[PDB]
């Protein structure tokens, strides 16, 4: 086992194959512990989950400081925090996976390269290298800074995202809201008038697949 694993791939390689809560250590530094939910089962496991939608119990219409820091219950609905995502994606080359489920149907999207910039970039999104079945709805958002109501698409739709004008992905939107563009949307799978019941975003090293 590795003593201060820096992501869920190094915690899974430590022999922990059950999904749940794990401690990771940013930059492998024992003074930078972060509790994360690891998905150890999807496509070989080793994923840090950073967004979960599943029941509408948590409020995702939150401000900049909340999106920077993280909020929620990591075993249920939560957002890991943009500062954490920047620090994790700075450790090496990471891939993004999105898992979606709605009324028994499932879809996914993977991006071979995924990073989140620092606060001076307003947590700029980078995604490249799509594969999947949900449709490449993140391409529209590539390169964009993050936006909240207090830093307007986030106000108009009462969510938060790397908005453009405004979105094809809205996974921090209003739970269960099928009004156009208001809900948990992945446009190229279910459009703008269907809020998705279950969604997770997660990341792991891109070289995991053959490490």
Curated annotation (Swiss-Prot):
Tissue-wise expression: Detected in fibroblasts (at protein level).
Subcellular location: Secreted, Extracellular space, Extracellular matrix
Sequence ranges assigned to domain Fibrinogen C-terminal in this UniProt record: 3-207
Organism domain of life: Eukaryota
Glycosylation sites (chain numbering): 179
Quaternary structure (record): Homohexamer; disulfide-linked. A homotrimer may be formed in the triple coiled-coil region and may be stabilized by disulfide rings at both ends. Two of such half-hexabrachions may be disulfide linked within the central globule. Interacts with CSPG4. Interacts (via the 3rd fibronectin type-III domain) with integrin ITGA9:ITGB1.
Family, similarity comment: Belongs to the tenascin family.
Protein name: Tenascin
Organism listed in the record: Homo sapiens (Human)
Gene that this polypeptide is encoded by: TNC
Span covered, complete protein: 1979 to 2194 of 2201
């Amino acid at each position: 086992s590795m003593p201060f694993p820096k992501d869920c791939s190094q915690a899974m390689l430590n022999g922990d194959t059950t999904s749940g809560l794990y401690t990771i250590y940013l930059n492998g530094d024992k003074a930078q512990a972060l509790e994360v939910f690891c998905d150890m089962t999807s496509d070989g496991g080793g994923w840090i989950v950073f967004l979960r939608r599943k029941n509408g119990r948590e409020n995702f219409y939150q401000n900049w400081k909340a999106y920077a820091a993280g909020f929620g219950d990591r075993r249920e609905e939560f957002w890991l925090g943009l500062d954490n995502l920047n620090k994790i994606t700075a450790q090496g080359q990471y891939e993004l996976r999105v898992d979606l489920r709605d009324h028994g149907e499932t879809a996914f999207a993977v991006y071979d390269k995924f990073s989140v910039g620092d606060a001076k970039t307003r947590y700029k999104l980078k995604v490249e290298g799509y594969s999947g079945t949900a449709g490449d709805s993140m391409a529209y958002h590539n390169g964009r800074s993050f936006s909240t109501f207090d830093k307007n698409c986030a106000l108009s739709y009462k969510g938060a995202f790397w908005y453009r004008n405004c979105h094809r992905v809205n996974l921090m939107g209003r739970y269960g809201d099928n009004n156009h563009s208001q809900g948990v949307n992945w446009f190229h799978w279910k459009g703008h008038e269907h809020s998705i019941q279950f969604a997770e975003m997660k990341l792991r090293p891109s070289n995991f697949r053959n490490l």
